[PDB]
Amino acid sequence: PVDVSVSIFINKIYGVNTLEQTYKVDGYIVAQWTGKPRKTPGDKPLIVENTQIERWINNGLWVPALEFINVVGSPDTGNKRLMLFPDGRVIYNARFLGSFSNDMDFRLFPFDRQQFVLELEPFSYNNQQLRFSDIQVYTENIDNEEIDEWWIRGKASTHISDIRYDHLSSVQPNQNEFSRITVRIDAVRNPSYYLWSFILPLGLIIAASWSVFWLESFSERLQTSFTLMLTVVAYAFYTSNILPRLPYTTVIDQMIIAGYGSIFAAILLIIFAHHRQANGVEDDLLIQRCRLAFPLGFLAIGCVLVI
Amino acid sequence: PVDVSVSIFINKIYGVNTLEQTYKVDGYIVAQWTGKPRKTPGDKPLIVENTQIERWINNGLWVPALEFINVVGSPDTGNKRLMLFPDGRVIYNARFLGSFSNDMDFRLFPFDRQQFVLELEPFSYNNQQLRFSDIQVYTENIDNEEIDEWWIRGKASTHISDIRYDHLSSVQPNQNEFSRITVRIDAVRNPSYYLWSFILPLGLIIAASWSVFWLESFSERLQTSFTLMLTVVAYAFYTSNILPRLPYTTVIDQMIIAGYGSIFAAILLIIFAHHRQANGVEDDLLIQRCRLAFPLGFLAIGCVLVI
Amino acid sequence: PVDVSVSIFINKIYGVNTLEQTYKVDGYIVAQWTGKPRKTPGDKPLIVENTQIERWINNGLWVPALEFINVVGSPDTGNKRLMLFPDGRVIYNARFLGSFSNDMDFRLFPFDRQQFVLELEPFSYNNQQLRFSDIQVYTENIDNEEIDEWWIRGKASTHISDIRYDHLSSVQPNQNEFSRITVRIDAVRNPSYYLWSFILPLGLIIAASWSVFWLESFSERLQTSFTLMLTVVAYAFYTSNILPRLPYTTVIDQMIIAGYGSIFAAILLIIFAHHRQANGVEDDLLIQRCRLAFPLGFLAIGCVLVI
Amino acid sequence: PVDVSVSIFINKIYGVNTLEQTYKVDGYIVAQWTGKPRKTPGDKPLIVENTQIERWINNGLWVPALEFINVVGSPDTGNKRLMLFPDGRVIYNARFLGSFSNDMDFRLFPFDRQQFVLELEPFSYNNQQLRFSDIQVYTENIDNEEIDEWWIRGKASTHISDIRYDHLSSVQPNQNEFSRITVRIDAVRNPSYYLWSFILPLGLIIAASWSVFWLESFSERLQTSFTLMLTVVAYAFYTSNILPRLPYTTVIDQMIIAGYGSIFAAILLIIFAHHRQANGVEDDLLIQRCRLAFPLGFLAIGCVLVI
Amino acid sequence: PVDVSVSIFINKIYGVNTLEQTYKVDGYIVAQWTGKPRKTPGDKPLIVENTQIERWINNGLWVPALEFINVVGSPDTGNKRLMLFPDGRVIYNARFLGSFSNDMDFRLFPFDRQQFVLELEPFSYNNQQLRFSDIQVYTENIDNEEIDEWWIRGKASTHISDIRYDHLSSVQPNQNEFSRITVRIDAVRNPSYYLWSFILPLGLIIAASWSVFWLESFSERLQTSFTLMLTVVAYAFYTSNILPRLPYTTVIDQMIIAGYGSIFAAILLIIFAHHRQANGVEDDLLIQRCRLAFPLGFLAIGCVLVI
Amino acid sequence: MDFRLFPFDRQQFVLELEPFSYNNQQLRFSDIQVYTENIDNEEIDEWWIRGKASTHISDIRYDHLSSVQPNQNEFSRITVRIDAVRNPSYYLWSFILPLGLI
Numbered sequence A, B, C, D, E: 001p002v003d004v005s006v007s008i009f010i011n012k013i014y015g016v017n018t019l020e021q022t023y024k025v026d027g028y029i030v031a032q033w034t035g036k037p038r039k040t041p042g043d044k045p046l047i048v049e050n051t052q053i054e055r056w057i058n059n060g061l062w063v064p065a066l067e068f069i070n071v072v073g074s075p076d077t078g079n080k081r082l083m084l085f086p087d088g089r090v091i092y093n094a095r096f097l098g099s100f101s102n103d104m105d106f107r108l109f110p111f112d113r114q115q116f117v118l119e120l121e122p123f124s125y126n127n128q129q130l131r132f133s134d135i136q137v138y139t140e141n142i143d144n145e146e147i148d149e150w151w152i153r154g155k156a157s158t159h160i161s162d163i164r165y166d167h168l169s170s171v172q173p174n175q176n177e178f179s180r181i182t183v184r185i186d187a188v189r190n191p192s193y194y195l196w197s198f199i200l201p202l203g204l205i206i207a208a209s210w211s212v213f214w215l216e217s218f219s220e221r222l223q224t225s226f227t228l229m230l231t232v233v234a235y236a237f238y239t240s241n242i243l244p245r246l247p248y249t250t251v252i253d254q255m256i257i258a259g260y261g262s263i264f265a266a267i268l269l270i271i272f273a274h275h276r277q278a279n280g281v282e283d284d285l286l287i288q289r290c291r292l293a294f295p296l297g298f299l300a301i302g303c304v305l306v307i
Numbered sequence F: 001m002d003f004r005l006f007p008f009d010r011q012q013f014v015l016e017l018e019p020f021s022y023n024n025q026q027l028r029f030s031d032i033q034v035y036t037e038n039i040d041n042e043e044i045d046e047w048w049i050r051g052k053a054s055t056h057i058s059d060i061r062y063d064h065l066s067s068v069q070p071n072q073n074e075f076s077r078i079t080v081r082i083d084a085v086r087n088p089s090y091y092l093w094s095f096i097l098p099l100g101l102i
């Protein structure tokens, strides 16, 4: 029941696809397993590069297909080599680049925590078993990820479990448990760019929105309101175009509704101030001095969005 | 007249293409059919992985090409294995990723009901017949589909019918019936994001549009109208850019016309109020108090949009 | 001089590319031609699927390369079969998906008439001749094409002509005429979406533009003009982004200039009204009552845009 | 030292890529060269289609790899045939589609002159020499290209020169000159669409910008300026999105700065008028009558942009 | 321990991908290494083109797989030839096009300095050693890079170092040092386009923003502020859409915050001016004459952004 | 230096640095800082530099008496090379031309 050692060198993780819940991983994979001894030229181990490998299989060299369970579509394989040893053992080494899938919650958008994962498992073998898994990452955190998009937190999580597959296990009674290496790296999004260039401007806009109450007239207030309205619609548009498209509301996306809100509540106040009067036309004395009472009310409701 | 058992494990449905009426499906397919017994090494069944399979065909192993009738372009095949059994039976197992086509009505829009479908049928065989179909989906609904885009309603819809193809059935008299497995999954779009972030803002915009009648002057009313106009055009653009492009009007798209409408109706009243007079310049007394009569008229016309 | 029968099943025409003058067509092609009789296993005709076909060619089976004259780049071929008959005749059957080219005039944009076309012709044969062509389309019109983008008018246009190719016909004296099947389907664009959601809003905008003459002041008129100016630029942008990019002016694109026009003519009038006077400042009495004379002049010029 | 005749049929030139300086060309290529006579079936020349060609090379048929020096990435080869003649001569014929590169100056912009080019040269042969080159285009100019994007001026430029490659010419002393066919067709951009739909609207906007001086007040003038400012920013955005992205300023791009300029110059004037006075607040009498002096100054500076 | 000479002809570097930190490089690679002498037809060296090469390996011709360490996905190989010499030496010559990865700091932005890099290294050989590396670039700078996006500063830079790979070096004791050629070209971004068309317009906008202090009223000042606000949001959108997307703030991106800043500070002053008074309503005399004190304060803070 | 195209030269000025007695002491990275400008003042100056920065840092074999120390005789050599063009003004304006007239 073959023991297989596996090593995964991860070279680059890039191009998240928020909508498809998808990321790209470039790296090498290495499998090692000891077979029946053989005679090699010299006694040096033998090297078999690319095209030559498939020919060695036509002569009964077994090389197991190891599938990336969580890759979306067959990956781009660059180079592959076999290392056939005189004492039997065999090393398969190949570089890969593949788009891998995992569940990704982006609802806390500019402040994400994500988990990029590789799942390896033999394509047709249940008593060929993954001996031990080793993942070699060569980076550093917190560091260059001001230039880079993501903050890795954890280093190395491995598993190597057994998968059941209870469906048509009568196709082969008593044996349908496959050996699955699971590799998972934890990462955090770099919330600098999105605050310094999206969160902050929106707040200033929402703040300056409240300055509508320091307009003297009423016509001034209500008319100006509509310009604020436009300002948000403009800023929502700017937001939507550049930010990653999703099927839920992000934190930024919530703040954008808060804008739409404060402004439309202003209009109501601005108008109800006018027509809650003692005569026909007296703006209600205290009410349009919600000048430093809208900011408080907004900030109070902006402390329950957090919890 | 060969019996073929089929099983389809569905791994992920993603990337709808509203314009092309198209979706992507990643999963495995398994075919089982009993052939002339053979000697396998040992008596254990024989495994034939990838490249090796095509070689077994060159020696007279028959393996039927099973076509995805409704796939748009030949799909990406990842790994394939044969399981040759000593008692004859044979298992073809392969992972696929393909862009599939089906009719899709998106007119409702953010409140969709769609039907993702697979159609399998042998490419050149009419008395080789699909024994039974089993589809294995491993998800859950109503559930994680706040993080996910779609709400599946049904689980398992199957078909296994006979297709006629009456065109040049004299090419082979009396026999042109192909066995077609049809698999169809029902799903609902998640109408959260689009309400919370598109429907609602537009309503507020349309609502605040009506507040034009609470402007005192006429110049104030008529001038402000044009800013409301701009506000809709802005919001139509924002809408159009982010939402899926289609060749018909969505619900949102109608609401956008309702905006364009109310605002232009306002303009007419606002102006007709001014010149429907007893003197040269008297704004008509009751009319510019359609303040809480436009909201009713719009809302009345917005309850016949539903039925 | 070989006779070849051809039939073309058209499964889907999708993804027009206005700039490249290009459309996508998914379907099957079948060629039939009678060769030297042969012995098949049993007496049942022999089936040769995919990879196996190329092997049968290495043994001297002639299978002509049929080229799609007007396909842009070699198409995606999915499955192919040979049907070798004991009495000689041979059937080639294969599914294709390809991006095809044809001349396409889009100057009447939302109200198009187009002609989607396939041109088939053998790649190296002049006395192998296309016997008869049959095209099998299974749709219906006027019908589901509210859900679908296009309205097919004609059904079946076929040709099968002979192409001259007079360049280096001394490479082979007296014989350079190739047999070219021409298939062409006529279709009309569904002008609903573009009217109900683009043409109409623009008209309301242009209409409301004229309401500028019902402003009392001159400062009111001239200033408001600049907001109208903004509105068109906004609406031009919205138009351009969503509509298909082209190298000529569409109908919509002209109407957008008509907007740009009426508004800039207003400014001139609005200003010329102010200074075409008897005293220093008298707005010319009749002129700023081109209130219901710009609409007529615009509508008069909008009845010569048609013829 | 083999003589090779070449003919290039150009079927379609489409999809310019302004940033990459890149275009697509679909067409056929034909190479002819006389070899050692051979026995053909019959005495009719022998036809060898596609896959079969590579098999004939395995038996010592020499077929020179002809490289497209200026193609970006190996091109899409559609169909290929050999024509083996009994008298020796051999004809290679294949259809190609490839993305070709050339230096492209887009600074003029909507009034471009460009030169689309093919450069052919053998990949490993210096005394195999391109006998004569022939290019077959079947179009017409001026004519259609109101429907088409480009105006071809010249017809046929050919070269067939010798390339030096002085780098490691000691790898093979005395012989490193390769025979290079050069084909180049000259074309002009169709400056209708961009004038009628971009150039023109911008001028009207810039013109209407100047009408700011016919506002009576000063507050009217200065405030309106900012709407003009917004108006340009709006139109700059519209321009940028639709027009081809570049790393230099186009003519349109300059015109857009001219807008930004006149409007900001207006602001300066409008304000300097107010505070260049004999009292505290007297708008300078002649200066705010730069009404028909800004138009002249702009048009004067717009006649030195040309030379 | 094989000596390998390498030459790299670089034809074109294009299509930077700011987000993925990625660039495209098309060129040829040449490897030369002297093997056991052989008999060639004639005594002329033998040429082996494309497909024929792979056949020569099946007969024991060793051709080392040389990997591009920093290429993202296996590159597009166009044509390849072997030049087998009678005296043993062998030349591998092939054209490639590949997307290569390198670290790229885009924070400066329109005034970038970048370093485009190739890393070549044998895929399975440590005592096969890269003798010497030669890179052939044929351009000129400062020069056409007004038409071209980038200004190359340096010419060459080579390395040829030894890489350790200390992970599972017990797989082969005492020998795991691979020979890596490193090529790096230095380049500068051409900051003309981004200054002349982005930096400048923004400044004029920000400058004209300050002209808000020369408005007479207070209602005029505060209301106009909101139009300036809109103007920046507009310009941010325009900026964001066209400029390369990044995960950090560019220089332009900072300037956009400076706009958002000055305008919101204006609002505060404009409002604080009104209610820092001796009576109920006296605008503070000196303060609203920060007319030529905001420009200075902004320019003072804009000289600490540099250092 | 090839001077056969004299008044119209292209030359390559080069530095080669390498440790005098060390093979596993290795030149980590090389950086060369030139502070000039071209085409420019080189009407006053004799030469026109074209390229800026060429570096190498290779390993030199020295296969002669490598048994003096078996298995280790590869020295780390920085190579720096600058490309330059001769200023063909003076020699044309004052030599080429007069001779043609003659």
Ligand SMILES: CN(C)CCCN1c2ccccc2Sc2ccc(Cl)cc21
Binding pocket: A010, A011, A012, A013, A014, A116, A137, A138, A139, A140, A141, A143, A144, A145, A148, A149, A150, A151, A152, A185, A187
């Ligand atoms: C600043 N350094 C974190 C840069 C590394 C960025 N990189 C990455 C990118 C996007 C999402 C997640 C990751 S994690 C990761 C794990 C291994 C390796 Cl080799 C690279 C990465």
Ligand SMILES: CN(C)CCCN1c2ccccc2Sc2ccc(Cl)cc21
Binding pocket: B010, B011, B012, B013, B014, B116, B137, B138, B139, B140, B141, B144, B145, B148, B149, B150, B151, B152, B185, B187
């Ligand atoms: C929403 N949760 C049910 C998650 C499922 C998302 N996913 C999906 C996406 C778009 C449209 C339809 C579906 S159904 C489906 C069926 C099987 C699998 Cl494996 C994935 C999916």
Ligand SMILES: CN(C)CCCN1c2ccccc2Sc2ccc(Cl)cc21
Binding pocket: C010, C011, C012, C013, C014, C015, C116, C137, C138, C139, C140, C141, C144, C145, C148, C149, C150, C151, C152, C185, C187
């Ligand atoms: C609207 N119903 C006619 C549905 C068909 C639409 N479809 C189509 C799409 C884009 C452009 C032209 C066409 S025509 C056509 C011809 C044959 C077939 Cl099989 C499909 C199509």
Ligand SMILES: CN(C)CCCN1c2ccccc2Sc2ccc(Cl)cc21
Binding pocket: D010, D011, D012, D013, D014, D116, D137, D138, D139, D140, D141, D143, D144, D145, D148, D149, D150, D151, D152, D185, D187
């Ligand atoms: C009607 N005529 C304008 C046709 C020319 C259009 N087409 C083209 C497109 C973009 C850039 C350059 C060209 S030139 C050209 C040369 C040969 C052929 Cl076959 C087509 C073209």
Ligand SMILES: CN(C)CCCN1c2ccccc2Sc2ccc(Cl)cc21
Binding pocket: E010, E011, E012, E013, E014, E015, E116, E137, E138, E139, E140, E141, E143, E144, E145, E148, E149, E150, E151, E152, E185, E187
């Ligand atoms: C003015 N000419 C130097 C243009 C250089 C543009 N091009 C380039 C593009 C993007 C990043 C780096 C470079 S460098 C380079 C090196 C060789 C060649 Cl062939 C082209 C380039």
Ligand SMILES: CN(C)CCCN1c2ccccc2Sc2ccc(Cl)cc21
Binding pocket: F013, F034, F035, F036, F037, F038, F040, F041, F042, F045, F046, F047, F048, F049, F082, F084
């Ligand atoms: C116009 N500038 C090129 C003047 C430089 C002349 N100078 C020089 C002289 C003879 C041959 C080559 C050079 S290059 C060079 C590189 C660096 C420095 Cl610091 C001086 C020089």
